[PDB]
Ligand binder design. Structure first.
Ligand code: MTA
Ligand code: MTA
Ligand code: MTA
Ligand code: MTA
Lengths: 287, 288, 287, 288
């Protein structure tokens, strides 16, 4: 068996791509910002594709979304106010809302078409999160939202950046700079945490290192971790910046008690997974 | 950039996903009696060994594979002196095992002389002279027969490392992945012995993975499951370690690092902290 | 620009395939006989795909259907009764019905799902041909239809075989044999003509030559010709067997007068195209 | 079988269609100052020259290309003595033109020394010694400059054959496809001279094709358009022949065959009947 007859050619590095059997195409939209496809794949189930890159799949998105959200949320001892930049399919919001401490969660995506198509075609991703009375969905460039938040003196406990990739995405490029992370720091409480996905350190080390150095220039505690996402073809790199709380100091017991006390149910993330993420070095080309 | 090329390897993975990998050069192509062998240069991963279309090892990421296959088992054993490797044709598994200063005798058994000979010639960064270490012996034989002979002879090893072609694709390795074969492996281990094998991938090939796992569990009281992403393969390779006496979960990072230091083992990846992460990270499965 | 992100991998020889950008998928059906896809391609417009092979495209099917049908129909001085084996999209029937001499045209396809999906999704192919009062559409294995025609003493003037390929198709394999062409001869009038597509002589010479020798064992006049069909990746080979009339003896004038007298309008086929088809050797591997 | 491989050339064609072609070997890879050159072996087509990812010629089907490019123009000319070839780096265009016993002087001008040198070394079935025929001269120069120099010098040819990289893809050949360049070609033809060029493909690249056609028509009173399927390219290559005096449509098959015989021309494809078919078959265009 080989992939086809109808296949997605998913870019990866420029020198490697994935060839993925497609069973159906549900939606194609050229938005003002990007090319959107919602399709069914044989190996990964339903997917969101943006500019040819799978952003999430039914079969493995929970690895991505739980790994993006819960280490930072569990590290903060009382996350009440949460900001999400990107996260158009709603799954980042879904995970953050599981924390019973959360009173307000704002999600800011530039592209109304991604959110509306996700609402319509990706119900296993959002799972109603867009309609939670604690949630607000804002259609705006996150750069502009953060500048307005600074003017307003707005502050959050946890900021989650769930954007398109730093190595491919023009629309997200301004949000991966040292200057942006300095703005993020200005809309965090003094014990705040930021987490971002940072592409991949194996295939895109220069872009990874640029995001890492921009977090380190602004946050005194930084954790790097990665999780293999089969549908993407690589282990996504995450970078967690913290003003006060050290994620490396949580024990599997402290994590599992915060999860239980806050009513958080997961498919992947646990205190032992947290320990593994805090101890596994990230991949690099070794020769 | 969207389509690597102009010359590309189409590397199978699941049957419903494959990798397209830019090729810069083709150094050797041999149809052996067992399999189709290619040694080539890739842009992303450097030089590769390809067997029946599957990358076995790449210069850029083989140390992730070989260190993860070898060192957890070798570090868990308090004094591994006698090591057996089944498969490992490029010599990098033997290279890693020989780093342990406790090792007195290492035997590697590959069915395919042509893989070993082309690796000797074209993959020096993989073997790094391991084939010619005076503690090493390279045997060309079906590992199935080698183990049958070892049992007749009463031979015993401390650590047995299975570095074979995949359980989901490889007819030549199929008989080495069974419950019956792991019962034969137990018979050629010392009472405190350890086995480790690669077991394909639990996300894309859970049925094949589970049959290897149930074959190990039937024969060993301690079974550890761990995985490591190997970029050039397109997935996290699953490893299964079976132990008769020593539990790899009981070894702290400081204990691992002290054993590596005492034994003179230098690595690019494996450390005590890596061991702790391998011991705690659940393996991937399709979640929907 | 390169094909994608969603692509058809169209087999060709086993050692060459085509990679074709897909814009939409209209229908997927696994029939009892074969895998059917109706899709839109960027280069070729809408296509019928059977077992991964494009059978016809909006942009180039008229090359195929006119080349299959009109040399044989124009060679016969009075084709009244026409049989088509295969031709599920209706375009072979469409072309044959243009000949004003035709009183009865029967089309026999094994697969109801191909005909019904073509009716629904390929109107530029059938163009109403299935509803012409001179046409009958029969769902049957053509092998069985021809055996029943022999029992009935049924006779035709022109028989057009428009089947799936001799080199790939199990369902059509019995219709490409010497014994089948002997049956065809039995349901032709003594001045009858047969024409079949025969795959490709460059990539599949053995299968081509088998069809050719089966026509030659049964028909004293045989013409070989080929036409490049871009969507397929090759020049389709045709073999015309004739009991009486020599297609090599028509002049561009005799063809253009038969076409005008019979009211036949074409996009490609003319008397000069006939002359070229009768004189161009077919492709073979030269080394 | 559905996906050729494991090692494959991804050959561009239209941007919305490409060919996947199994590769058996890579003999040479050179980045010249002008283009990326690969000489490789394909399963379907044998040895190939590839320039910027496009197959230029294959052992199995190059004679269809070279015979169709050269012989209609050469047979239409009643006595072609002086021949100029622009491009034709593998030497097969020169090989075909030299078959005509009337030819006294043939000059081939390629911009890229590396294409000619690698063809000499690796494509002997294409040049077949043509580079070393005493009637031949190989010049390494931009054909644009060669023709500017020829005009200054008052040089004239009987037949000019343009065998360049494609008008739709090739920056190095772009200036040779213009109306202005065909006016310079007229100035270096004898009064009864003939030009022929390949012109890409009218089905996939009709705009580029039409601009070459209108450039020829502006400068020549007789223009013949014909095409031939070249399997390894994925399309029927379009040719455009411009003539000052002799009409290729007026030559019957018997006249063609007699000229080929008198001149000692042996071919694998081209005959008088082929000429008649080329003269009568309309070129392909998208019909919807
Ligand atoms: C699907 S998760 C990634 C999301 O990041 C969003 N995105 C990309 N750039 C920006 C931006 N500058 N501000 C907010 N959202 C963005 C995209 O629209 C997408 O839905
Ligand atoms: C490259 S590492 C995998 C190796 O497993 C080897 N192998 C596969 N099957 C067997 C077997 N039955 N016995 C020993 N080696 C084998 C292959 O020849 C290959 O070199
Ligand atoms: C699309 S044109 C080719 C057609 O040949 C038809 N076909 C294949 N084998 C047979 C058969 N044995 N009898 C009749 N039609 C056939 C297929 O169903 C298809 O629609
Ligand atoms: C292989 S046949 C096509 C040839 O056209 C040649 N070519 C392309 N542009 C020019 C040019 N401007 N002058 C002469 N040769 C050229 C290329 O180097 C190639 O070898």
């Amino acid at each position: 068996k080989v992939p086809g007859p109808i296949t997605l050619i998913e870019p990866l590095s420029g020198n490697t791509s994935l060839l993925i059997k497609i069973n159906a195409i549900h939606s194609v939209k050229k938005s003002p910002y990007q090319e959107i496809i919602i399709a069914d794949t044989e190996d990964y189930g339903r997917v969101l594709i943006l500019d040819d890159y799978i952003q999430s799949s039914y079969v493995d998105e929970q690895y991505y979304h739980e790994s993006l959200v819960h280490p930072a949320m569990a590290t903060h001892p009382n996350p009440r106010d949460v900001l999400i930049l990107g996260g158009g399919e709603g799954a980042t919001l879904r995970e953050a809302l599981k924390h019973g401490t959360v009173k307000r969660a704002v999600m800011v995506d530039i592209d109304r078409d991604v959110v509306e198509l996700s609402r319509a075609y990706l119900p296993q991703m959002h799972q109603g999160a867009f309609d939670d009375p604690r949630a607000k969905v804002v259609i705006q460039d996150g750069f502009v939202y953060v500048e307005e938040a600074i003017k307003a003196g707005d502050k959050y406990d946890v900021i989650i950046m769930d954007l398109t990739d730093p190595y491919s995405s023009d629309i997200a490029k301004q949000l991966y700079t040292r200057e942006f992370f300095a703005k993020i720091r200005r809309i965090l409480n003094d014990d705040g945490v930021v987490v971002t996905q940072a592409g991949n350190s194996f295939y895109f080390p220069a872009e990874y290192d640029m995001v890492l150095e921009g977090v380190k220039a602004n946050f005194p505690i930084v954790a790097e971790y990665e999780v293999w996402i089969p549908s993407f073809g690589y282990a996504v790199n995450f970078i967690l910046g913290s003003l006060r709380y050290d994620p490396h100091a949580l024990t599997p017991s402290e994590v599992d008690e915060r999860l239980r006390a806050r009513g958080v149910k997961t498919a992947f993330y646990t205190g032992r997974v947290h320990l593994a993420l805090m101890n596994m070095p990230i991949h690099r080309k070794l020769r």
